[PDB]
Every structure is written in structure tokens, then in C-alpha cells.
mmCIF file of C-alpha atoms in Angstrom:
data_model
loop_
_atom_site.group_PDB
_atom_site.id
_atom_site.type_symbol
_atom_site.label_atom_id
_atom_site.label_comp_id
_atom_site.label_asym_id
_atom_site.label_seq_id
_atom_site.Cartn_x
_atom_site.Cartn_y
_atom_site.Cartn_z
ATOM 1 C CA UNK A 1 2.123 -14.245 -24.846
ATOM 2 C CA UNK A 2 4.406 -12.366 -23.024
ATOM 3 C CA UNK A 3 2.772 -8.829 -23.191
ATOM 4 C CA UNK A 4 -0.463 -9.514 -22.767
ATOM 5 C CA UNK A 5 -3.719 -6.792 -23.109
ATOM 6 C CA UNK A 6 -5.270 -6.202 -19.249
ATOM 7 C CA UNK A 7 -1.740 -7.481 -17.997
ATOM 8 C CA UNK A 8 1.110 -4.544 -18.598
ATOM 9 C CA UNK A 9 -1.092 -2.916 -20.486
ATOM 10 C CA UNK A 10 -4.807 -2.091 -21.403
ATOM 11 C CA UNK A 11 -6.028 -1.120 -24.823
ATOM 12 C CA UNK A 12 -8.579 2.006 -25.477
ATOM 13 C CA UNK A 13 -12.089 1.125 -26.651
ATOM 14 C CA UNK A 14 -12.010 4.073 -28.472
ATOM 15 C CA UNK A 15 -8.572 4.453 -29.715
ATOM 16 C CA UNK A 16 -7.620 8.464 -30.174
ATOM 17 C CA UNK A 17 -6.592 9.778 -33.671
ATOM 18 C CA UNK A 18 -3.588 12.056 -33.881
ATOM 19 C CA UNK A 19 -2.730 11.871 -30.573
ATOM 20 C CA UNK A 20 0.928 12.089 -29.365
ATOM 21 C CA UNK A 21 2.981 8.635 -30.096
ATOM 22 C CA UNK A 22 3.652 9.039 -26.132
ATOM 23 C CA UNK A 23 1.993 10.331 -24.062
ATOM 24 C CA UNK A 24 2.403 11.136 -20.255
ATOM 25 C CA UNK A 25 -0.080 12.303 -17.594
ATOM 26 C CA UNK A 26 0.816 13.916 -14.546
ATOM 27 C CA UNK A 27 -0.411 16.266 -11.418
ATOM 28 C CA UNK A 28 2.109 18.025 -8.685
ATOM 29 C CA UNK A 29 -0.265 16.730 -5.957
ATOM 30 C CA UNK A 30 0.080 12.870 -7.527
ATOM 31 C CA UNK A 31 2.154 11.194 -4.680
ATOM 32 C CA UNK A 32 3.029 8.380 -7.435
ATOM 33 C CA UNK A 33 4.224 10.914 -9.880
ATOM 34 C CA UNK A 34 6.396 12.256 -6.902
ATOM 35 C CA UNK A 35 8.107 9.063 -7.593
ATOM 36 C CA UNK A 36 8.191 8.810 -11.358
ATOM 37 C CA UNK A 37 10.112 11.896 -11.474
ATOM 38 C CA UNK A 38 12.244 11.567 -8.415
ATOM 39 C CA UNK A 39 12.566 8.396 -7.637
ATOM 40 C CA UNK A 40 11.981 6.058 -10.863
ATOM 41 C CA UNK A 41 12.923 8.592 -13.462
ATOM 42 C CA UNK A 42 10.161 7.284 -15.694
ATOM 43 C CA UNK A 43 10.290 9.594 -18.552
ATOM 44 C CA UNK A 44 13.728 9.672 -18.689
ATOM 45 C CA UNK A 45 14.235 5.852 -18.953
ATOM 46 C CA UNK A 46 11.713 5.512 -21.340
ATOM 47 C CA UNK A 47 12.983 7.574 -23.936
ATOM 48 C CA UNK A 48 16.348 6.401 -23.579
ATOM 49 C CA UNK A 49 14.529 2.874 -25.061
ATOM 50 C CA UNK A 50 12.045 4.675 -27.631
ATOM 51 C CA UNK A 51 13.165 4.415 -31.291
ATOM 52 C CA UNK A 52 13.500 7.135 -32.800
ATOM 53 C CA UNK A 53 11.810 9.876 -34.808
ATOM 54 C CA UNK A 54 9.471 9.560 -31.546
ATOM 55 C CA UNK A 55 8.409 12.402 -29.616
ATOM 56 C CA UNK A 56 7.403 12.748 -26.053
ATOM 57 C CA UNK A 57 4.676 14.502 -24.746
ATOM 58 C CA UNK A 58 4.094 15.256 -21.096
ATOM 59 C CA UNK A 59 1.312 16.993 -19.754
ATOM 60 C CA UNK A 60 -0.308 18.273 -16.571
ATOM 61 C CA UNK A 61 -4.149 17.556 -15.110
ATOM 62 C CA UNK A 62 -6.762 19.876 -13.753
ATOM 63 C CA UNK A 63 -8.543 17.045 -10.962
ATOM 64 C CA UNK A 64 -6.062 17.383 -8.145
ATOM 65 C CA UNK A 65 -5.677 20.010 -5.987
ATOM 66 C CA UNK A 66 -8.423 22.575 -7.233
ATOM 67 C CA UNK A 67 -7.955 25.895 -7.778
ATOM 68 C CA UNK A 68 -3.901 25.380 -7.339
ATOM 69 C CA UNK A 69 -3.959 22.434 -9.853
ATOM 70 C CA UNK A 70 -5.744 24.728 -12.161
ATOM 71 C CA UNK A 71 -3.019 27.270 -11.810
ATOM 72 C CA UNK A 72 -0.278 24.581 -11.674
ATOM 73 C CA UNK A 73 -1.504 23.296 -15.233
ATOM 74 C CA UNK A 74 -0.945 26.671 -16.414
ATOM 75 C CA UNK A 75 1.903 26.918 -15.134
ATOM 76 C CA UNK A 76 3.035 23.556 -16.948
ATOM 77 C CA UNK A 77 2.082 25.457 -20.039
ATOM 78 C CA UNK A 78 4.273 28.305 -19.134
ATOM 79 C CA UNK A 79 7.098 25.946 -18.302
ATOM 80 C CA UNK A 80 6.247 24.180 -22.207
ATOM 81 C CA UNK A 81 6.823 27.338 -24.039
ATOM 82 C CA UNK A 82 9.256 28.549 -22.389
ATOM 83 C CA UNK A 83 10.797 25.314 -22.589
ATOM 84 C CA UNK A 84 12.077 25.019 -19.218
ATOM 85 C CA UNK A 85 10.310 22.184 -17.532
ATOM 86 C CA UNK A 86 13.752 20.501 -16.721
ATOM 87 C CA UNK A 87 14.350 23.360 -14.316
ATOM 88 C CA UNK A 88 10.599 23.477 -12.398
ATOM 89 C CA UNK A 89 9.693 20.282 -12.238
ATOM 90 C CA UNK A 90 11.883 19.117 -9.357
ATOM 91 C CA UNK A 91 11.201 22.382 -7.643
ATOM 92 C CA UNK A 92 7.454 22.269 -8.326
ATOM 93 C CA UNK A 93 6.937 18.666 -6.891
ATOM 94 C CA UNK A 94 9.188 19.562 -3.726
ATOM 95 C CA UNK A 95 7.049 22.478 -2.908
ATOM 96 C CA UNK A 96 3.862 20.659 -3.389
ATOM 97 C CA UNK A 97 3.989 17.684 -1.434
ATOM 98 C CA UNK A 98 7.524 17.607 -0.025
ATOM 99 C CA UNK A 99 8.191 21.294 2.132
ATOM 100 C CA UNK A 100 4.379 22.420 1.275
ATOM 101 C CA UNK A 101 5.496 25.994 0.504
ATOM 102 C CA UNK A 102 3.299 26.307 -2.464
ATOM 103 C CA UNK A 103 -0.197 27.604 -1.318
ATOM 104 C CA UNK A 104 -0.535 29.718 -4.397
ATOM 105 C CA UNK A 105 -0.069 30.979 -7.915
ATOM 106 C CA UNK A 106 2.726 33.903 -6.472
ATOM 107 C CA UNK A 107 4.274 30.943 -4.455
ATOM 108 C CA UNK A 108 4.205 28.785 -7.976
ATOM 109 C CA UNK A 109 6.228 32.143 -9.504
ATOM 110 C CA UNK A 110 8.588 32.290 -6.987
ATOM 111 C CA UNK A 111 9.833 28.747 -8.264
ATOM 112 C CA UNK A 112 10.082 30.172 -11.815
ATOM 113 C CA UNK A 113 11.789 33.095 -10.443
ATOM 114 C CA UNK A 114 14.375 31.514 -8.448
ATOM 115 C CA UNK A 115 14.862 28.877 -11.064
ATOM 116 C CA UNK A 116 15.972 31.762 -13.273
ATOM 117 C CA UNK A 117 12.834 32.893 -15.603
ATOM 118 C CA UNK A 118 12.606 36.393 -15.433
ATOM 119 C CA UNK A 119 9.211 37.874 -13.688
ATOM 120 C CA UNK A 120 8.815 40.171 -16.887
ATOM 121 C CA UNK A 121 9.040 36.608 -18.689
ATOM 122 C CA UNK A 122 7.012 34.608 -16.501
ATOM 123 C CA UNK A 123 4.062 36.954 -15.973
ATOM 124 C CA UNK A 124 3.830 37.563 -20.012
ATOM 125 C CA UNK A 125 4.361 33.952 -21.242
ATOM 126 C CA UNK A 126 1.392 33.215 -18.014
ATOM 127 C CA UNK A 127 -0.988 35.724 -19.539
ATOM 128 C CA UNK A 128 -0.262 35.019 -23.481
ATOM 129 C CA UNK A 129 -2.711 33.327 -25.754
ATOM 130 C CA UNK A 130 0.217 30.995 -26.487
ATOM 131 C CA UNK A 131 -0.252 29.702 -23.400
ATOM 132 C CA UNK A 132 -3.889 29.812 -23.181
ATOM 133 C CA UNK A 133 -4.220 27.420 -26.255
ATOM 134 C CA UNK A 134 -1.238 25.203 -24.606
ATOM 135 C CA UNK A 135 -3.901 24.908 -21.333
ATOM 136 C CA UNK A 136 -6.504 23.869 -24.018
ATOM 137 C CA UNK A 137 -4.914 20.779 -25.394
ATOM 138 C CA UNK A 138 -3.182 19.865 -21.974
ATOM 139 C CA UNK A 139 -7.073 19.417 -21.394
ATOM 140 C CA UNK A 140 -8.364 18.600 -24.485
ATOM 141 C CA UNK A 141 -5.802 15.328 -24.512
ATOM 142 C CA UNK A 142 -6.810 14.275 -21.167
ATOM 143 C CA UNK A 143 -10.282 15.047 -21.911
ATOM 144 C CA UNK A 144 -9.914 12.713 -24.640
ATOM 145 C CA UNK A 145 -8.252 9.552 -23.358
ATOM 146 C CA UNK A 146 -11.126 9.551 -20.332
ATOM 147 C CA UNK A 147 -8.292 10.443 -17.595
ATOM 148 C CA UNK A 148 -9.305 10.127 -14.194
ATOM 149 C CA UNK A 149 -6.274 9.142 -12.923
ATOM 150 C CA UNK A 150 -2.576 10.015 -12.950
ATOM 151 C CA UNK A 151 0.198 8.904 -13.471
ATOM 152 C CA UNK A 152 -0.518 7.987 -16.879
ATOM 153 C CA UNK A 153 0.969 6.677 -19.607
ATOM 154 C CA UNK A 154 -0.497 6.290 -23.357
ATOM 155 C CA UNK A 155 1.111 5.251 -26.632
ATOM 156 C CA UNK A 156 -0.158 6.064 -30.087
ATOM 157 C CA UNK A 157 -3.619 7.235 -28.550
ATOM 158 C CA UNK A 158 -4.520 3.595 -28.470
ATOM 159 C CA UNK A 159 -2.528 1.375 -25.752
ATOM 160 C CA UNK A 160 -2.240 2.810 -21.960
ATOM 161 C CA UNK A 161 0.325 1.482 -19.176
ATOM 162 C CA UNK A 162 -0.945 -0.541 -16.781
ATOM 163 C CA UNK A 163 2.316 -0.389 -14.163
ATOM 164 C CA UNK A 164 -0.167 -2.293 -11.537
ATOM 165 C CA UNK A 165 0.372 -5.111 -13.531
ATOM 166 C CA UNK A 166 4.255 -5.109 -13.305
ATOM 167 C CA UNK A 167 6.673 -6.274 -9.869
ATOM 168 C CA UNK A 168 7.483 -3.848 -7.431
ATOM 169 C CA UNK A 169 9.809 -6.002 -5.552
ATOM 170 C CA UNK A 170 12.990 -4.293 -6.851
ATOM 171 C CA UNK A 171 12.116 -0.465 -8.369
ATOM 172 C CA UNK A 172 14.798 -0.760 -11.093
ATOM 173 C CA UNK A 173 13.271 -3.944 -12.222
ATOM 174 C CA UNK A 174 9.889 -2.317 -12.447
ATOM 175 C CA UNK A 175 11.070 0.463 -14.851
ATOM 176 C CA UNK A 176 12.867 -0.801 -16.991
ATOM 177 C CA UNK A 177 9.850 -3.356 -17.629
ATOM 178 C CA UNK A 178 7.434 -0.362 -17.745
ATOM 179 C CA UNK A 179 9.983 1.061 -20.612
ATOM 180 C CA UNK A 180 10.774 -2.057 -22.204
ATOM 181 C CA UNK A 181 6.664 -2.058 -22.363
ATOM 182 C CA UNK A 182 6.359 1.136 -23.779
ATOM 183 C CA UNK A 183 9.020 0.087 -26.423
ATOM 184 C CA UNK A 184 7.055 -2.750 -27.435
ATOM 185 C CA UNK A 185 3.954 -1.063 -27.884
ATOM 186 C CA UNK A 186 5.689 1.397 -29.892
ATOM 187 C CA UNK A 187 6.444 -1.014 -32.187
ATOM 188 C CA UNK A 188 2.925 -2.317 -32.338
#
């Protein structure tokens, strides 16, 4: 066929009930997730080819960059219910890996802060329960997919992108066949 399992995609053993109908995977310190934001607009593109009624779900990971990635997941979860992760994300992956000026939770605030977010509003969205349970099913959802790597990408908890498996030669070519993939197994 012409998307074929182990090719542009892999499918789950042990397929995930309830999960998200798409799902993404990501960590500040992922130097390929740099690029899926920045450079390849991954998410974007992708949901401009999703049916829809579908909702996408993005999420942070805990195994990169210890005690910072900790903080930087719950800082994703601040970002989620506060609902402005189009305004830190750029900022957050810049001072991770491109100026290096995030060395710590305060530093992660000052992005918040200069993007806008009050510090009244940051600090008690960071230390509500509303966010705790948001850290919880970042982690339960990786926890549950087996996730030792990012980027990610996982549709219906049972089908997860295999972008290895796709050309590189020409970088618009490659996402619109990672979307186009996601689209099909949408449809699945």
C-alpha cells in the first residue's frame, strides 16, 4: 500500500483507550522539536489538514533536562490553563537551547512575565491544584503511550508517527507528508 505500518507510521501493541484523537509530545531541550515549532510548523500544518470536530492535544515531558524539565512541564501546564501557549512557546524554546538564558524556574517566569501574564497570575495559576492535576495527565499520557522519546506524535491512542520513515530532502515536502499522514490515520 501506500501507507504502510513500520513505514510512516507504527501501530501500538497496546492501543490506549480515551486518549486524545491527536496527540503531540514535546520537551524545550528536544533539538528536533526546536524545529517542529520553528522551523516546520508541525502542529500548525497538521491541523490545517485534520477534519474536523478533532481536537489537538499537545503536551510537555519530564526526561530532558532534569530538574528544569520538571519545572518546564509545569510550566506547560500553566501556559494550558491560562491558555497562552501561543505566546511562550517561541520564547521558551529560544531561551532553552537558542540564547541559554533559562537556568531556572524565576528565569522560566520572566518569559511569562514579559510575554504579558501578570506575576500575581503566573505564581497562582503555578501553585493551583488546577495545574497540579494538568502536570498529572501531561504525565499520565506519556506514561501511557511508553514515551521515551520526543518529538512525538500519536493519533487515536493507537497509531504513532514515524517521521524517520518520510524524505528530508526538501522540509516542505516532509511536512506536508507527515500531515497528510496524520490525516489518513485519522480517518482510519
Amino acid at each position: 500500500a501506500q501507507y504502510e505500518d513500520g513505514k510512516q507510521y507504527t501501530t501500538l501493541e497496546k492501543p490506549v483507550a480515551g486518549a486524545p484523537q491527536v496527540l503531540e509530545f514535546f520537551s524545550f531541550f528536544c533539538p528536533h522539536c526546536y524545529q517542529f515549532e520553528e522551523v516546520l510548523h508541525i502542529s500548525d500544518n497538521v491541523k490545517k489538514k485534520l477534519p474536523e470536530g478533532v481536537k489537538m492535544t499537545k503536551y510537555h515531558v519530564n526526561f530532558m533536562g532534569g530538574d528544569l524539565g520538571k519545572d518546564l512541564t509545569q510550566a506547560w501546564a500553566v501556559a494550558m490553563a491560562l491558555g497562552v501557549e501561543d505566546k511562550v512557546t517561541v520564547p521558551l524554546f529560544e531561551g532553552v537551547q537558542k540564547t541559554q538564558t533559562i537556568r531556572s524556574a524565576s528565569d522560566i517566569r520572566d518569559v511569562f512575565i514579559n510575554a504579558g501574564i501578570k506575576g500575581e497570575e503566573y505564581d497562582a495559576a503555578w501553585n493551583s491544584f488546577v495545574v497540579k492535576s494538568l502536570v498529572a495527565q501531561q504525565e499520565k499520557a506519556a506514561a501511557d503511550v511508553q514515551l521515551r522519546g520526543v518529538p512525538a506524535m500519536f493519533v487515536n491512542g493507537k497509531y504513532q508517527l514515524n517521521p524517520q520513515g518520510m524524505d528530508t530532502s526538501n522540509m516542505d515536502v516532509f511536512v506536508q507528508q507527515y500531515a497528510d499522514t496524520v490525516k489518513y490515520l485519522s480517518e482510519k
